[PDB]
């Protein structure tokens, strides 16, 4: 389950679980048609280390998806 | 046959790009005195083949 | 990641202080018992395969439903996943045992694990039991090894147990 | 937090592997080394008070101008925050000594150092000079492998700031 | 052509080399540029003619 | 002398050689000073096996330097066939994986990320594969995990220079050759001040990477096709980078892990500063 | 090739970093440990001949049927290739002892083991039983930390084969 | 990657042999001198920044063309690249010194380096010189450090020199 | 689960494409071949058990030490779990026959096989010999394309175990 | 990728023509012999492991140098690489045999292979021999299988041989 297992190999310090409403920031299907992503990837839970927290958020917003939540990972 | 082409004297003078030419009629450093007259026997004149 | 020293340091820092003479000597004692600790970690590493195997044989001896169709350790693919998880947990328990702190176990292995298994339909009570069996055999090995100097390893056997017991509790 | 113990465990884990003789040999180094490290730690710990006041002053003696009116070595609050900062460094040096690695320094002082110092107009030169001074005096509090350890970590901070 | 016409006269001792006997491959390599004048020579000297 | 035909005459093994000559072997017959042609700065010649020892000795004496020896017959079979990889087969991992859908992904990430070297079964990253199977991480996430692993560090980083590492990195992670000298430099400076790990992240969090692979697509070759903001000479670099289906990244070569893209070649695409 | 020295260097290099006190402490472990390791190595080296013949035989005594005709413990060539193979294992054990890590075992015997054994119809059980026997006899050639080292590596091979 | 032991092992294996009593004692001696070796590596680590800085100051003192426009250590970007390379080479020399073998230096730093610099237009003779200066200062530090026990480190100073000299030769 | 139908659909989907004449031709093969497949399936289905008892015994007859005490072909539970295991294989063979592909074998027996067999000390040789025997007897229950099908899948299992 | 039909089509197109009645019937014959072809491909698939194993046993029987230290099929890592390559080549030969065209073999396997082996120091003549042995055994199986209808498969046995012979020639 994206119910993070362990530290999810992030190492680092704290783990924040951040969910975003990703658009085709990521996951455009390789298909010929219009840069969609599966329907069930509307919200994308993801666990990142404290050191990598800021960079990721900057490139999420930059590519247009908007953060929906944020909780410390544990 | 290889020995002429692949030798110090041939290589030093004809490089890799010049074509070989008569040099017997001019003093070349290191030749013996008899190079000059001997060359005349070898050469028969421009028609001579 | 923390070890037993790093833990001391974090608590000291939260006071804004150099380590207390209290904490110093607690850590001097850990250094005092460290050869025993190395033998204890070595006991597990040197018998990892048998510890998993023996735990396994016994788990399925008790719970013959897991190896029937419908059961969570059937067919070969699922049994291999179950054997793999037994190894993963034994591995992080040995790491905690070298470290003198449970954090690597809790952070890299136990965190989220129960909810994973429930999502999967993996019976957590059976997984807890497999961990209890690994504990029995692992400690067996910590206590009765090849030509190690004779002495008392009960403190370390307890501590190893709590790591096995953390995992069990966290999962069941 | 980087220690010999965490490093070998990290390397095992990432290959899905039990600790083997390579990794346990490594750990023995860290444990064999603890005595010298911890002697350095105790000496730096009890002299902390004066090591800090010595280095603080030396920052003003080497950068005289810092102590006038309108400057960053003037008034109780600057001079207070300075002592504190050198004290933070010595604190993490002792932690790194006790821990068996640079982890405490890496996680609590090195990660982010330049960004912070740059936003707050803090010159590394001061901090290097604080540490160079601390290194001078620690020459006569310790010797042998405890001194080498103290030095290792002081120098590590100076390189982090250059 | 200068190199090729010249070479023949110079190395075949001015004997008439007729159209029917050119060494077809000596020159091919020399044109395509794989070989030098020096190895063009070494390939005429070991030819049948 | 250049690009050859045939191998042998009586019989031989032709080797083609390459050097850098002084005006001592080749000069013009001009009135002054001895010079060789500027474009035959490094010259190559194909010699059958017996004449070979004699030729190398001569060349070295009169001043030249041998740059290479390689059999002619190796070098006659062209450039790689690229049909398999002009346009590849994409592999993508779906939301509820099927049990062997996920099996497909792992085998491919391995092949692509590790550059076709064998990863033996003792070797595989099992705990990490566990994670992908349960969905805790995604295909891009997993791809980052392999790169920071020792196996990746060990076959590709520890034993070669940074120039080589970065060039491999582009091939593996991005599927394309490295476009500029600046790219090489920009990367080497990062590794030097933020370490190996930060530097690894820089290809996996890039905008270029994100567009093409998104997050559930295994990185696949894409440099044999025209891309954007790609210099034109980066399509010839790709041939130098990938040597055919049976070729691989291999650190076990007799000569070791070395380059493949000439440093001179990179500069042709532009030189600036920083 | 995995040794304590190569491991710490690998970890430094991959972070673009000079060796620091963490890494040098580790190295000291490997160097402090060399004496016990190398005593094990010398004892295993000179007894090699008999350790090999002892283990070879024990494979036949534990798997009697192997020595009957039509079987893989029959004829000079099988029995020859067996002695050789156990000799390879003892050789790499001594190398791992001398090297300060499992590298020699990992690179020359573990990488590829199962694929090879599976293609050639070689049962790991034999090899485990060869090694279990070698472990029994090495109990009285060594003691203390040399025995622990010998054991560490013998056990490492047995786990590689299970 | 090789170290001095690993090298022994590879040569032994190519004979099909257990290590020779010859090779054994050569390695026993390396263990004998290992405390000195650790001090020698520590001497470099503890003064890395100054070693690079001092080498640098002196390189540009000698070769004032590099810091003119047209020069390969001009403008700031290029100087930072040059300072970075000085550090990279000093780093792999220290690794070789801990290892007792040049291979990490040759394989992950020196291999291809000359051809890189020529492609870039970086004057290799100047780079060779910067390496010679690092050597002078580095060895200076190996020989005259903080309260190390007095003894003879010339064997190690030589070996460090050959690593500096390998790099120089490889690059010029 | 790999069948001709799932394979062509997978290939269409992955190119974002409707099924075309290429893919429907393929499907016709699978449907045209169902009759032979399903005849093999019915024959293997009704003549079933004895195949298991025959192969189980043959494992002990070929590895006599197996049926001796202290061994893994001794006692009711080992011999019971053996019959069961061969029965699992025949079951998945019939499934693969009926399904039109190796899917059932790949998903339920091949994925994980070696790890399991290695942890439990189960030699593939037994299983190969069980299957070689089953292959001998299936020579006279079937013929023509039903036999070829039965063979295809039995051989597929034997290669999975080598 | 080409098969025997696709090849016809490419040659026709280069003329700007619909397939010649010549080419049509050549392809009608391939369809005529296709059941035999399927049995031939099936013969290889069904005995792949033994074909590789038996080739292998015999290769090292002949060339006992490969399994000595210094030899290219020593230690386990290299033997596993060699066993794998045997499988890879047998695999692409079977693909060519289903296809009725060598192209997949030449394009995905043989292209560059010789130069790879030379770079690696892998003795190509030994690899060629391993391929010759696979051929002997593979064809053995194509010719003498389980209850296949009796007939003449020599045309297909030849064609399979040329694929084995292509690979051998390409590599040696
Ligand atoms: C797994 C296969 C799959 C499906 C089924 C799929 C659906 C899907 N439809 C989408 C958008 C859309 N779908 C529609 C469809 C409609 N608009 C209408 O008014 C009509 C009622 C209806 C057409 C009948 C529209 C207009 C959008 C764009 C919404 C927007 O961006 O504002 C998106 C967002 C990403 C994108 O715009 O590409 C997804 C993921 N994506 C997939 O990968
Ligand atoms: C889209 C643009 C963007 C923003 C705005 C952003 C915010 C942001 N701030 C963060 C951390 C942080 N932010 C702060 C900020 C503060 N601490 C204090 O005490 C003050 C009240 C305050 C400064 C005024 C601190 C201290 C952390 C680190 C928290 C930790 O790791 O413990 C993190 C976690 C990742 C990281 O540490 O890099 C994010 C994502 N990230 C982005 O990409
Ligand atoms: C083995 C060493 C060696 C010697 C000794 C030598 C002599 C020599 N002197 C020559 C010409 C010559 N030598 C002279 C010399 C003289 N003219 C005078 O009036 C003076 C009396 C005298 C100078 C003292 C002249 C003028 C020529 C050119 C004749 C011409 O081409 O008309 C030539 C014809 C080739 C040439 O012109 O280069 C030879 C071979 N060559 C050699 O290789
Ligand atoms: C390669 C990594 C490494 C290891 C493994 C290591 C082990 C090690 N264990 C030791 C002692 C010992 N080890 C034990 C362990 C035990 N006693 C028992 O009765 C229990 C069965 C077992 C519990 C774990 C005891 C009791 C001693 C003696 C007391 C002591 O030194 O603390 C010693 C001191 C020397 C000796 O007395 O033999 C070493 C060096 N040293 C190392 O560098
Ligand atoms: C410098 C310019 C130049 C000239 C003028 C020249 C003449 C010349 N004529 C030759 C032969 C010849 N020349 C002839 C000519 C004739 N036969 C007859 O019966 C007729 C009377 C006459 C034609 C009108 C014949 C037949 C030969 C060949 C003799 C033989 O090989 O038996 C040869 C011998 C080499 C060869 O055969 O190629 C030379 C050198 N060579 C030259 O390089
Ligand atoms: C096809 C017609 C042709 C050209 C153009 C040619 C260029 C050429 N210039 C050369 C050398 C040279 N060229 C120069 C030129 C210069 N040095 C400087 O500092 C200045 C910037 C520049 C003068 C403006 C120098 C100094 C060398 C000798 C390099 C050396 O040997 O160290 C060489 C090497 C062979 C030799 O030294 O004779 C060639 C082939 N060769 C040719 O055959
Ligand atoms: C961080 C270290 C780590 C852990 C601990 C981990 C657990 C874990 N166990 C899993 C599956 C599994 N785990 C088991 C385990 C069991 N089945 C039983 O019946 C027994 C009670 C038990 C063995 C004792 C089984 C059978 C599955 C497969 C479930 C399925 O796919 O149906 C999965 C799903 C991904 C996969 O199948 O690979 C994860 C993530 N993953 C990790 O990365
Ligand atoms: C494997 C470890 C490793 C090494 C050794 C390495 C060398 C290296 N040095 C480079 C550039 C450079 N190196 C220098 C160095 C110098 N300039 C001078 O004038 C001096 C003589 C000298 C300093 C002593 C300069 C100036 C550049 C930039 C060249 C340019 O872009 O114009 C580059 C191009 C990429 C970049 O600029 O980041 C590489 C790959 N890279 C590596 O990864
Ligand atoms: C460098 C490390 C290394 C190892 C460990 C190794 C194992 C190994 N054992 C082999 C064969 C063998 N191994 C044995 C083993 C035995 N026979 C018996 O009598 C006993 C049952 C048993 C010993 C316990 C036999 C009989 C063969 C011949 C197999 C064959 O070719 O049929 C082969 C096949 C090549 C050959 O025939 O030599 C390898 C590669 N090779 C290596 O390079
Ligand atoms: C944290 C990693 C680590 C280090 C750095 C370490 C150093 C170390 N250096 C030592 C000795 C020494 N070190 C040196 C070094 C030198 N002598 C000189 O005059 C030169 C200036 C310098 C040359 C490098 C000498 C001469 C000795 C005494 C002889 C010996 O023990 O070999 C000793 C033995 C105890 C002693 O005599 O002080 C240790 C433990 N041990 C460790 O675990
Ligand atoms: C769905 C497909 C599937 C397969 C194929 C399968 C094999 C399989 N065989 C097992 C055990 C076993 N397998 C055997 C096999 C045999 N004993 C003998 O008398 C013969 C030598 C041989 C039969 C040829 C034995 C004795 C055990 C018990 C092993 C143990 O627990 O010690 C186990 C361990 C769980 C258990 O004890 O039941 C699995 C998973 N499991 C599956 O789910
Ligand atoms: C496109 C399909 C494909 C082929 C054909 C292929 C061949 C191939 N064989 C390799 C190695 C190898 N190949 C062998 C093979 C042999 N050794 C011997 O002595 C025998 C003569 C022979 C077995 C018959 C060996 C031993 C190596 C390892 C060489 C080394 O690392 O030292 C490598 C280097 C990468 C690696 O080791 O995984 C490649 C790319 N790779 C491919 O992707
Ligand atoms: C599942 C994929 C598939 C396969 C494998 C397949 C095989 C297959 N092989 C056949 C015939 C045959 N197959 C062979 C093959 C051989 N004869 C020999 O003596 C050689 C040992 C061997 C050489 C390869 C022969 C001779 C025939 C009869 C003639 C013919 O139909 O062409 C037939 C026609 C029916 C029959 O006569 O039995 C089928 C359906 N059909 C399929 O759909």
- Which ligand 5 atom is nearest residue B46's CA? 1
Over G84-108, what HEC string results? Answer: HHHHHHHHHHHHHHHHCCCHHHHHH
| Residues in chain C closer than 8 A to F99 (CB atoms) | 77
The dihedral through the CA atoms of C59, C60, C65, C67 has a sign that is positive
With an 8 Å CB cutoff and a minimum of 3 pairs, decide whether chains E and I touch.
no
Q: What is the resolution in angstroms? A: 2.8
Cβ atoms of residues I115 and C52 within 8 Å: no
Pick the closest to residue D58 from D111, D148, D136 (CA basis).
Answer: D136
Contact F159/B at CB under 8 A: no
Alpha-carbon span J131 to G113, nearest angstrom: 23
Contacts of F164 (CB under 8 A, 6+ apart): F257, F258, F259, F260, H111, H112
Pick the closest to residue F120 from F134, F109, F110, F130 (CA basis).
Answer: F110
Pick the closest to residue C145 from C23, C7, C50, C18 (CA basis).
Answer: C50
Span from the CA of B47 to the centroid of ligand 5 (angstroms):
10
* Angstroms from F72 CA to nearest CA on chain J: 11
Q: How many domains does chain G have?
A: 1
Euclidean distance between the first and the last CA atom of chain B, given in angstroms as a whole number:
21
Cβ atoms of residues H111 and F256 within 8 Å: yes
Contact G100/D at CB under 8 A: yes
Alpha-carbon span I144 to F25, nearest angstrom: 76
Q: Residue I87 burial (CB < 10 Å; 0-12/13-18/19+)? A: middle
| Residues in chain H closer than 8 A to D162 (CB atoms) | 49, 53
Contacts of D140 (CB under 8 A, 6+ apart): none
Beta strands A67-72 and F42-48: pairing type?
unpaired
Alpha-carbon span D116 to H114, nearest angstrom: 39
Contacts of J96 (CB under 8 A, 6+ apart): J102, J103, J104, J105, J163
Provide the 10 A C-beta neighbour count for residue D14. Answer: 19
The CATH number of residue D159's host domain is 1.10.490.20
Contact E34/F at CB under 8 A: yes
Return the structure tokens found at A19. Answer: 């969910």
**Chains contacting J with at least 3 CB pairs below 8 Å?**
F, G, H, I
Cβ atoms of residues J157 and J139 within 8 Å: yes
Over chain F, what HEC string results? Answer: CCCCCCCCCCCCCEEEEEEECCECECCCCCCCCCCCCHHHCEEEEEEECCHHHHHHHHHHHCCCCEEEEEECCCCCCCCCCCHHHHCCCCCECCCCCCCCHHHHHHHHHHHHHCCCCCCCCCCCCHHHHHHHHHCCCCHHHHHHHHHCCHHHHHHHCCCCCHHHHHHHHHHHHHCCCCCCHHHHHHHHHHHHHHHHHHHHHHHHCCHHHHHHHCCCECCCCCCCCCCCCCCCCHHHHHHHHCCCCCCCCCCCCCCCCCCCCCHHHHHHCCCCCC
How many Cβ pairs closer than 8 A exist between chain A and I?
7
| CATH class belonging to H1-172 | mainly alpha
Quick check: bond before G96 cis, omega within 30? no
The dihedral through the CA atoms of D60, D61, D63, D65 has a sign that is positive
Provide the 10 A C-beta neighbour count for residue F39. Answer: 7
Helices and strands counted in chain A (H then E): 1, 3
Find the largest Cα–Cα distance for chain F: 81
Euclidean distance between the first and the last CA atom of chain I, given in angstroms as a whole number:
23
3-state helix, strand, coil in chain B (%, to 5): 40, 0, 60
How was it solved? cryo-EM
Return the structure tokens found at G128. Answer: 């485990």
Contacts of J121 (CB under 8 A, 6+ apart): F254, J72
Cβ atoms of residues D96 and D153 within 8 Å: yes
Return the structure tokens found at D64. Answer: 């005289």
Angle at H103 between CA H101 and CA H106, to 5 degrees: 130
| Residues in chain G closer than 8 A to F252 (CB atoms) | none
Contacts of H119 (CB under 8 A, 6+ apart): F262, F263, F264, F265, F266, F267
Is there a contact between F148 and D14 if contact means CB atoms under 8 Å apart?
yes
Q: H140 in helix, strand or coil?
A: helix
Cβ atoms of residues H79 and H68 within 8 Å: no
Range of the domain at I104: 1-162
Contacts of F10 (CB under 8 A, 6+ apart): none
Q: Which residue's CA is the closest to the ligand 4 atom numbered 15?
A: C36
What is the phi/psi pair of residue F25, to 5°?
Answer: -110, 125
Pick the closest to residue F221 from F247, F251, F200 (CA basis).
Answer: F247
Angle at G140 between CA G135 and CA G141, to 5 degrees: 90
Task: Rounding to the nearest 10 degrees, give the CA dihedral for residues D86, D87, D88, D89.
Answer: 50
Pick the closest to residue D8 from C3, F116, G88, F155 (CA basis).
Answer: C3
Strand residues in chain I grouped as ranges (E): none
Which of left, alpha, beta for E29 (phi over 0: left; psi -120 to 50: alpha)? Answer: alpha
Pick the closest to residue F197 from G2, C105, A11, D19 (CA basis).
Answer: A11
User: For chain J, what's the residue count?
Assistant: 172
Provide the 10 A C-beta neighbour count for residue F68. Answer: 11
The dihedral through the CA atoms of I142, I148, I149, I153 has a sign that is positive
Beta strands F66-71 and A46-49: pairing type?
unpaired
Q: Residue I33 burial (CB < 10 Å; 0-12/13-18/19+)? A: middle
On whether C35 is known to bind a ligand per the annotation, the reply is yes
Return the structure tokens found at J46. Answer: 């069904």
Cβ atoms of residues J142 and J127 within 8 Å: no
Alpha-carbon span I131 to I133, nearest angstrom: 5
- Residue in chain F lying closest to H95 (CA): F158
């Amino acid at each position: 389950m994206s119910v993070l297992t362990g530290d999810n190999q992030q190492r680092g310090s704290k783990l924040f679980k951040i969910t975003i409403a990703l658009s085709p920031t990521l996951a455009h299907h390789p298909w010929p048609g219009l840069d969609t992503h599966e329907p069930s990837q509307s919200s994308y839970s993801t666990i990142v280390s404290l050191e990598r927290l800021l960079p990721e958020m900057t490139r999420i917003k930059r590519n247009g998806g908007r953060i929906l939540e944020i909780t410390e990972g544990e | 046959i290889d020995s002429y082409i692949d030798s110090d004297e041939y290589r030093r003078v004809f490089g890799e790009n010049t074509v070989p030419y008569f040099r017997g009629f001019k003093y070349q450093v290191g030749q013996a005195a008899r190079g000059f007259d001997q060359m005349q026997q070898l050469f028969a004149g421009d028609a001579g083949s | 990641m923390q070890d037993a020293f790093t833990k001391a340091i974090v608590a000291a820092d939260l006071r804004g202080s150099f380590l207390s003479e209290q904490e110093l000597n607690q850590l001097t004692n850990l250094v005092k018992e460290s050869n025993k600790r190395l033998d204890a970690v070595n006991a597990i590493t040197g018998n990892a395969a048998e510890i998993i195997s023996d735990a396994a044989h016994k788990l399925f001896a008790e719970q013959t439903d897991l190896i029937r169709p419908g059961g969570n350790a059937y067919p070969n693919r699922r049994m291999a996943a179950c054997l793999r998880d037994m190894e993963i947990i034994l591995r992080y328990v040995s790491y905690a045992l070298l470290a003198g702190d449970a954090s690597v176990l809790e952070d890299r292995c136990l965190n989220g694990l129960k909810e994973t298994y429930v999502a999967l339909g993996t019976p957590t009570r059976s997984v807890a039991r497999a961990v209890q069996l690994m504990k029995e055999t692992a400690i067996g090995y910590v206590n009765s090894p090849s030509g190690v100097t004779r002495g008392d390893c009960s403190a370390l056997v307890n501590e190893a147990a709590t790591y096995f017991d953390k995992a069990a509790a966290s999962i069941a | 937090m980087k220690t010999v113990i965490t490093e070998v465990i990290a390397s095992a884990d990432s290959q899905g592997r039990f600790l083997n003789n390579t990794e346990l040999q490594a750990a023995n180094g860290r444990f064999q080394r603890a005595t010298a490290s911890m002697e350095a730690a105790r000496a730096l710990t009890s002299n902390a008070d004066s090591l800090v006041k010595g280095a603080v002053q030396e920052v003003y003696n080497k950068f005289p101008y810092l102590t006038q009116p309108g400057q960053m070595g003037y008034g109780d609050t600057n001079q207070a925050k300075c002592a504190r900062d050198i004290s933070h460094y010595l604190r993490f040096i002792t932690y790194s000594l006790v821990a068996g690695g640079t982890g405490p320094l890496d996680d609590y002082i090195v990660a982010g150092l330049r960004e912070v110092n740059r936003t707050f107009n803090l010159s590394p030169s001061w901090y290097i000079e604080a540490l160079k001074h601390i290194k001078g005096k620690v020459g006569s509090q310790l010797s042998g492998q405890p001194l080498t350890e103290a030095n290792a970590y002081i120098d590590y901070c100076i390189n982090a700031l250059s | 052509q200068a190199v090729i016409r010249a070479a023949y006269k110079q190395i075949f001792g001015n004997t008439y080399i007729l159209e029917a006997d050119r060494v077809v491959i000596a020159e091919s390599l020399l044109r395509n540029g794989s070989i030098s004048v020096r190895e063009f020579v070494r390939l005429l000297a070991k030819s049948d003619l | 002398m250049n690009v050859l035909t045939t191998s042998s005459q009586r019989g031989g093994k032709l080797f083609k050689v390459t050097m850098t000559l002084s005006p001592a072997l080749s000069h013009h017959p001009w009135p002054s000073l001895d010079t060789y042609e500027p474009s035959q700065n490094s010259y190559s010649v194909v010699v059958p096996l017996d004449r070979l020892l004699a030729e190398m000795t001569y060349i070295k004496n009169k001043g030249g330097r041998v740059l290479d020896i390689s059999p002619a017959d190796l070098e006659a079979l062209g450039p790689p066939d690229i049909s398999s990889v002009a346009i590849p087969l994409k592999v993508e991992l779906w939301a509820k994986a099927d049990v062997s859908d996920v099996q497909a992904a792992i085998v491919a990430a391995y092949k692509q990320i590790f550059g076709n070297t064998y990863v033996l079964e003792s070797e595989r990253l099992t705990s990490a594969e566990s994670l992908l199977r349960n969905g805790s991480i995604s295909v891009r996430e997993f791809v980052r995990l392999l790169a920071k692993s020792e196996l990746y560090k060990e076959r590709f980083f520890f034993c070669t220079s940074n120039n080589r590492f970065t060039e491999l990195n582009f091939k593996h992670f991005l599927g394309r050759a490295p476009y500029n000298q600046s790219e090489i430099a920009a990367h080497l400076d990062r590794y030097q001040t933020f370490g190996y790990d930060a530097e690894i992240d820089s290809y996996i969090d890039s905008d270029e990477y994100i567009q093409a692979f998104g997050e559930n697509v295994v990185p696949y070759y894409r440099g044999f096709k025209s891309q954007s903001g790609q210099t034109v000479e980066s399509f010839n670099r790709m041939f130098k980078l990938y040597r055919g289906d049976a070729g691989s990244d291999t650190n076990l070569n007799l000569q070791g892990q070395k380059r493949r893209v000439d440093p001179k070649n990179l500069l042709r695409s532009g030189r600036g500063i920083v």
